[PDB]
Structure formats: structure tokens, C-alpha cells
Amino acid sequence: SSGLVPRGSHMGYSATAPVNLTRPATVPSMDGWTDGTGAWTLGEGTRVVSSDALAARAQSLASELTKFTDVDIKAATGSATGKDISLTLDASKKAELGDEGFKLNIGSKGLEVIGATDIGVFYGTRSVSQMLRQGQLTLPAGTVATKPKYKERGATLCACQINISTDWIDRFLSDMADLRLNYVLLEMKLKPEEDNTKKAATWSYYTRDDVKKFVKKANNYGIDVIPEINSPGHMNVWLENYPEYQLADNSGRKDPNKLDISNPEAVKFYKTLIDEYDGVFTTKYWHMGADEYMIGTSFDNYSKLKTFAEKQYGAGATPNDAFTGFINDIDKYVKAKGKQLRIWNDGIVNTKNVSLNKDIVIEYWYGAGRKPQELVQDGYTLMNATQALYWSRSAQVYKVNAARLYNNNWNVGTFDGGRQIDKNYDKLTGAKVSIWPDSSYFQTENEVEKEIFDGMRFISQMTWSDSRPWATWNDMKADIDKIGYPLDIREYDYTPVDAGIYDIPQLKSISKGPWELITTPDGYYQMKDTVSGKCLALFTGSKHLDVVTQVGARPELRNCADVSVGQDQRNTANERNTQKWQIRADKDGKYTISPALTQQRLAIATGNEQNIDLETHRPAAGTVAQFPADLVS
Ligand SMILES: CC(=O)N[C@H]1CN2CC[C@H](O)[C@@H]2[C@@H](O)[C@@H]1O[C@@H]1O[C@H](CO)[C@H](O)[C@H](O)[C@H]1O
């Protein structure tokens, strides 16, 4: 017999360690590790030790680690032993570590994490978590210092038209933090409240309270949440109920997506929205979008913009001049609020009489004029937002292929359509992936979460480390899976009730029930009415992106779809996903039921709910209908 037995190494440092004991991987990788003598073992008595100032970081890591290791790891102040993880903020190490970098020293004095800022120290702790939650509690001795090559690292998250649940955003923010991603462009609607703007309070929207909560979580994780209100195109969710601000073509037909930038009341309406967001986002940036204004058409069909150009910016001025002038005017406005402006690159056009202010950050997603190289020569600040880092729930041409980017040597300097610029260009801020809903019924938000996993590790690695220490994608994939998700995601209670048979009074107007609940692989439920044999669906009402956004829409009974299959069954996606429901536990113990796609909540209608959609149609009082949560607290 073999005698196989656990090594069961004593806690703390040991001068003795095997030469090739595995150093557990991280993402981002920490390159240039210098090996030392021996190894350090987390074990019973290991504490996380820090100053009072770092006490919250220390307590949160001790908790975390207690949960991952099954050892009781307490936080403390005072002296550290060789048994301990130490957290140190040393601001004098800015030159070495920057605002975000960190140093690990593993050895006889234990596991030391050193940062020059609170966020650096926090970031060090993400590597410590990663390293110790792979089933190994012994780490080889040595030292490494690491900092991100690029200043902006993260994602565009389009929480736009459709709602991405605040619980999803929270999980996403923890995922980002674990990967040392510090940037999220959140295109979204903050519920408008002013008399002048409140008719745009259609769903999706987020409350002021919702936003202040996820922003404060973001800032604790080192993440800049930058809002976007795209303009002057892609404005349907703002101008639908304000036709007075929509741009008409030459024949008088209005487009709810197009802002009439020759109308000063319209410009002012946009500026009013900037002012509403200013109260709840802490960032120093404003993103005005400026992408795809004329998609589906041309400036030749909007002669009003030419006339406006010429009046406004003198004879010779073109519609492109008016467009840029609108951008410059929004620039001037946000700068007076202390902000820097950001846009998409496809706005930037050939202008005769006006030129785009150079103090506007250009996020470059589309190979169409200027090319990246030309924007470099004229001195623009650039972020790489290449389409090669796009996911879309419906557009299958937009699926990040991380294997391919890894194996083909893509870097942050590889702009859209393989246009390589100097990756050390001094105004290259970094790079991001982009998460787009488009036609939204094809994939649930929890399916988006599973899918983006890999691409998020890829962009973390290349924006921080800009290296390929794994020989192939497949090696990186093996390690990123061993690393796995941060604790908050592992703890999220996706399906808080067991499958089974339930009485649900809230649903009495549809059926006396009872209801058979079964779970789905993406963390939702199907609800079968045992009376009719049919299943509850949120299927009918007015939609954006092919999803029912109508406030007060009623669910219905439909033939049961197969909710057990994956997102590659595109042909049945709508019947399937309109039959998914998210159940959540209250603080404490009461359950809400939300349609998985819409993320409104089922409630009994009172008739006192106030929303613009309800002015035009209200479900019968006392029936069960979907409503944003803020209307039913
Ligand atoms: C900046 C950008 O990429 N603009 C649109 C084009 N791309 C190409 C692939 C994606 O489908 C993406 C579109 O989703 C982008 O538009 C955004 O669409 C959302 C809804 O999906 C909102 O309407 C935004 O305002 C658009 O910018």
C-alpha cells in the first residue's frame, strides 16, 4: 500500500521547501518574481495584521480567507509574526508602485503586502486571495513588485433600454476588482425627476439610491464608474416622449433616436440630464457617446443642420461642423463642472470651420476615419475599445475570442481591424471589453456572466501585465479556472428556494395554483401552474430591444418551454427566456419574483403607482403585473 498522507505542514515560514513547489497563478500575472529560500504556510493562528487605518481591509481579507481555507483567520493590529499576512500602506513608494501597484514579500517575516495607496494595498490583497484559494496553503518564498502598464482597464457595460440588475452589477464589480480592472463605462438611465425630464422615466432606469450604492461599492474597489448618455444619436429612450426635441429630415419625419442639435431647448434638455447625473456619480468624467448619429441615413437628408452650421459657425460650415460644435459645446459645459469629456471615435469627422477640442478622450472602436495612427499624430488621447473585444447577446459576429487574441499577439496598441499603433504611445490610456445587449431575449444576464468570464481575464492580463507568461491560451485557461471567481460571486444566492411545489398568493389572479418550481442552469426558475399545465411568462407589452419594458405589463400562461437548454438554442430563445423568473430573498425572509429578462418585479397593482407608461395604460387594479421595484416598496 502507498501510504499516501497529507503533508500537513506547520503554519508560518519554513526554511525548507521543495525547489519546484508550485507558485499558484494569479490574473493579472505578477511577472519577475524573485524566488527566495523556503516557503510560507497559512495555518491555525495566522492572522491578517495591519494599522488602524487598514483595519477594514484587514478584517475583510481575514473573513474572506476564513471562508476559502476553512481556517479561522482573525484580523489584528500591532506586531506581525512570521505566521501572519501583513498589510502595509507606504506612500513613499509611489515611484516604484504608482497609484495602483503593490509588492509581495513572502518569507520569514510572513506574507507582506505593500502598497503606496489604499487601492494598491487592496489590489495586493486580490493576489493574496487568488493565490490561497486554489487548495494550496503553502506559498514559495520570495518577492515581487507589480504595477499596471495602463491607467484605464475594464469594460463598457451597456445597461441601456434593458435593465441589468443591481445585483448583477454588484457581482460584476467584485469580478472586476478581483482582476484589478478599474474602469466601467456604464451607459444607463438614471431615473429623471425634473418636470422638464420626467416623461423619460421609462424602464430601464436606476434610482438615485441604487446608483449611490453601486458607485460607493465601486469606489471601495478602486473602480471609476463613468456614466454615458449617448447623444446626439441613439436617444430613443430619452426622446420617445419628447418629440419636440427630435430631429426631422427634409420631409418632416422625426426620429426619436436623433436629438435636434439646432434646437437650443433640446441641447438644454441634454444638459439638464448631465446635471441630474452629477449628484450621484463621483467620477471626474462625462461620456456623451457621439456614435452612429446618422446610421441608417446621411446628413444630406437633414438640410436644417447645414443651415444651422452656416449660421452658427460661418459660411462654408457643414453638418459635420455642427456635430463637432455640439461636442465642443458639451465639452465646455462639463469642464465648467470640473469634468473631462469622453466620446466614441466615429463621431470625429472631416470638419471645415470647427475642430474638435483635443482635451476630449477618444475611445476608439471603429476603423473609420481618422485611422488610429492619424489620431496619434494629432495628439489625441486614446483608449482602445476595439470591436474584437465586443460581446453582443444577439449579434454573433460580436463574441470575444480570447484564445485567438492571446495566440495571435494582440496588445493594447492593436486598435480596431488590426491597426497597430505604438503600444507605448504616451496618451494611450488603456483598453476595454464591451458588453452590449442588442436584441436581448437570446441570452439572460446570467448567461452573459458565464460567457464573458474568459474575455475579462484576457483584458485584465493585457492591460496590467501586457505579457504572455502562459505558453498558450489553453495554459492560461487552466489557471484562470483554478483561480475562479471572487467570494461574493461564489456566495450569491442564485436560487434561494428549492425546486418543488409552492403556494403563491401573489399569483392568485392568474391561477389558484399551486405552482411547480424548477431551477435552470443560469440560476432562474420556471413556474408551472398545476391547474392549467401551462407556465408563467412575461411575454406581452411594449418593448425595447425585443424585451418587454412596459411598466405594468401583465404575465400570462403559455405552453411550457424547455428551460433546461443553453443559449445556443437561438430558435426557441424568446419562449424559453420569457419563462425564466428570478426569485430573491428580502431582508429578511420574504420573496420577490422578477421576470428574468425585464428585471421589474411582480406586484399586485394598487392603481397608485406613478409612471409615464401608466398614464397611457394601467393594468386593472388588484391584478398582478410587473413594475420597477421603486414603485412597489
Ligand atoms: C459605440 C458602438 O459600438 N455603437 C453601437 C454599435 N456597436 C457594434 C456592436 C454592438 O451591437 C454595438 C451597438 O450595440 C452599439 O450601440 C449601442 O446600442 C445600445 C443598445 O444595444 C444603446 O442603444 C447605445 O446607445 C448604442 O450606442
Side-chain angles (χ1 to χ4, degrees):
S1 106
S2 74
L4 174 80
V5 60
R7 224 302 212 275
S9 284
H10 198 270
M11 50 277 216
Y13 179 80
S14 195
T16 283
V19 186
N20 290 293
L21 177 68
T22 300
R23 186 170 86 60
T26 65
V27 53
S29 64
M30 299 165 309
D31 300 344
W33 177 267
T34 293
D35 283 320
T37 326
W40 178 83
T41 288
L42 178 146
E44 183 188 38
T46 290
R47 298 169 307 155
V48 176
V49 176
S50 85
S51 76
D52 294 300
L54 289 168
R57 302 290 191 194
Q59 287 149 30
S60 171
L61 184 66
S63 281
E64 185 176 356
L65 296 181
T66 293
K67 280 164 199 205
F68 282 131
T69 71
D70 298 334
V71 183
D72 192 337
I73 299 298
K74 305 206 142 155
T77 58
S79 303
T81 80
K83 271 255 269 297
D84 291 331
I85 297 155
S86 289
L87 306 184
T88 298
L89 198 161
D90 179 359
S92 71
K93 287 186 189 303
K94 278 284 165 69
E96 190 192 8
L97 304 175
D99 290 330
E100 298 183 286
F102 62 85
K103 197 173 188 217
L104 308 174
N105 298 302
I106 310 199
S108 53
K109 292 176 206 304
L111 199 186
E112 315 176 33
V113 180
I114 304 153
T117 58
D118 173 61
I119 291 299
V121 168
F122 174 60
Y123 279 174
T125 67
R126 306 299 93 215
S127 279
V128 169
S129 192
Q130 281 184 358
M131 290 174 97
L132 290 167
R133 77 204 192 197
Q134 303 188 54
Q136 192 177 307
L137 302 180
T138 306
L139 310 184
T143 187
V144 67
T146 182
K147 67 187 161 146
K149 181 183 180 71
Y150 295 99
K151 296 312 196 271
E152 292 187 327
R153 310 177 307 276
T156 296
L157 176 68
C158 205
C160 44
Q161 313 210 33
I162 58 77
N163 185 254
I164 305 274
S165 66
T166 52
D167 286 356
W168 197 104
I169 291 164
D170 285 344
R171 291 197 312 260
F172 189 69
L173 287 174
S174 299
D175 210 32
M176 281 179 73
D178 197 77
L179 300 184
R180 271 48 74 84
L181 302 171
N182 68 1
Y183 169 117
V184 60
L185 176 72
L186 190 67
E187 182 185 356
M188 53 76 81
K189 176 179 288 170
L190 173 68
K191 192 181 180 162
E193 249 153 46
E194 316 217 72
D195 305 298
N196 176 39
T197 65
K198 79 184 289 199
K199 312 209 308 190
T202 45
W203 190 259
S204 174
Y205 61 65
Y206 299 83
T207 65
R208 295 197 146 249
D209 294 338
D210 292 336
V211 187
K212 291 172 182 176
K213 288 176 164 183
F214 67 65
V215 165
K216 164 182 174 169
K217 176 179 268 234
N219 290 324
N220 182 243
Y221 291 158
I223 299 169
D224 194 6
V225 190
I226 306 181
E228 191 195 336
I229 308 192
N230 206 351
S231 70
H234 282 290
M235 300 209 74
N236 61 346
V237 307
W238 291 104
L239 308 179
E240 265 167 349
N241 297 325
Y242 296 102
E244 59 267 41
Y245 303 146
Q246 296 171 18
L247 181 59
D249 64 23
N250 292 350
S251 72
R253 269 182 295 157
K254 285 172 160 180
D255 189 359
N257 273 304
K258 296 189 193 75
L259 192 69
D260 183 341
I261 60 166
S262 78
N263 182 338
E265 199 72 16
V267 170
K268 166 164 160 175
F269 169 94
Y270 188 68
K271 286 172 184 179
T272 309
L273 302 171
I274 297 182
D275 294 348
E276 296 171 23
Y277 281 49
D278 176 79
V280 304
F281 289 97
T282 49
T283 189
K284 254 74 157 94
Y285 298 101
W286 183 263
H287 203 303
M288 66 169 295
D291 69 297
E292 290 181 340
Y293 189 26
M294 284 284 138
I295 188 162
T297 183
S298 140
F299 286 124
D300 300 342
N301 300 322
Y302 297 91
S303 304
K304 175 175 215 205
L305 299 193
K306 199 266 207 66
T307 307
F308 171 65
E310 285 193 272
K311 182 86 212 147
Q312 189 61 40
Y313 309 102
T318 71
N320 285 337
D321 288 322
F323 178 78
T324 308
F326 171 70
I327 292 160
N328 286 340
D329 178 59
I330 296 305
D331 187 29
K332 165 190 291 291
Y333 191 81
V334 302
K335 286 190 305 207
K337 299 169 87 68
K339 315 246 178 260
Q340 192 181 11
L341 191 64
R342 304 177 81 97
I343 64 189
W344 302 119
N345 73 288
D346 57 304
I348 179 262
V349 279
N350 300 325
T351 58
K352 297 200 211 134
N353 292 28
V354 176
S355 85
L356 181 68
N357 301 341
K358 306 266 189 62
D359 73 3
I360 303 171
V361 172
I362 310 289
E363 312 189 340
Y364 194 99
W365 76 275
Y366 181 62
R370 317 212 210 116
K371 248 63 146 280
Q373 227 337 280
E374 301 168 41
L375 282 166
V376 163
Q377 287 147 0
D378 236 64
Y380 283 107
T381 299
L382 290 174
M383 188 182 196
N384 184 354
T386 173
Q387 296 177 73
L389 294 168
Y390 275 22
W391 299 271
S392 176
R393 305 184 179 186
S394 50
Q396 295 186 277
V397 311
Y398 295 116
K399 288 306 186 186
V400 179
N401 185 341
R404 176 131 85 211
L405 305 184
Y406 190 90
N407 294 331
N408 76 6
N409 306 294
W410 185 88
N411 58 58
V412 163
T414 316
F415 272 52
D416 188 61
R419 308 168 157 83
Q420 184 67 44
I421 73 183
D422 173 10
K423 74 174 172 162
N424 291 313
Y425 176 46
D426 41 46
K427 314 219 186 74
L428 179 50
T429 69
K432 55 181 172 160
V433 299
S434 301
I435 298 158
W436 307 103
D438 294 332
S439 188
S440 284
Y441 65 81
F442 284 107
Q443 220 187 356
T444 61
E445 65 173 35
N446 287 350
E447 280 177 327
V448 175
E449 187 174 46
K450 289 169 184 218
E451 180 182 72
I452 61 183
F453 183 77
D454 283 357
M456 299 280 303
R457 284 86 190 140
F458 174 76
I459 200 58
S460 171
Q461 176 59 25
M462 303 306 303
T463 54
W464 185 288
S465 292
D466 176 36
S467 69
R468 292 191 195 69
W470 298 271
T472 55
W473 168 259
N474 286 337
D475 296 315
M476 186 174 174
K477 176 62 173 151
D479 273 328
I480 67 175
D481 289 341
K482 279 151 71 83
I483 296 169
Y485 274 135
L487 192 54
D488 299 335
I489 292 175
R490 304 200 201 191
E491 280 182 340
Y492 185 82
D493 198 5
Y494 283 93
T495 52
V497 301
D498 300 324
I501 306 151
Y502 287 86
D503 290 317
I504 310 181
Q506 187 171 69
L507 298 185
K508 70 179 39 159
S509 72
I510 306 291
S511 172
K512 98 121 59 229
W515 296 84
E516 294 176 11
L517 268 58
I518 60 140
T519 51
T520 63
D522 51 346
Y524 301 119
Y525 297 78
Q526 184 166 50
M527 300 187 303
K528 184 178 150 191
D529 173 28
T530 64
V531 178
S532 52
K534 289 158 131 162
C535 287
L536 200 76
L538 202 307
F539 193 87
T540 302
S542 54
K543 303 183 174 173
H544 293 80
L545 301 188
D546 302 312
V547 162
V548 179
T549 52
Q550 191 170 356
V551 170
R554 288 174 67 194
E556 63 191 79
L557 293 173
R558 298 178 69 80
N559 290 342
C560 291
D562 181 345
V563 294
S564 78
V565 295
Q567 67 174 58
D568 292 310
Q569 306 305 308
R570 294 179 59 95
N571 69 326
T572 46
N574 188 239
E575 284 285 0
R576 171 171 70 258
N577 287 338
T578 55
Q579 295 184 28
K580 286 169 179 172
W581 300 91
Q582 185 163 0
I583 300 176
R584 290 171 176 92
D586 248 7
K587 340 78 219 161
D588 47 286
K590 272 183 129 188
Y591 297 104
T592 64
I593 303 178
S594 303
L597 292 174
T598 81
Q599 296 293 321
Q600 296 195 22
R601 307 283 182 265
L602 296 190
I604 302 296
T606 73
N608 300 318
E609 300 89 2
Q610 297 299 307
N611 183 260
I612 175 64
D613 282 355
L614 309 176
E615 280 157 52
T616 89
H617 178 73
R618 203 177 264 291
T623 61
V624 55
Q626 78 165 8
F627 292 95
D630 75 312
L631 301 189
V632 295
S633 335

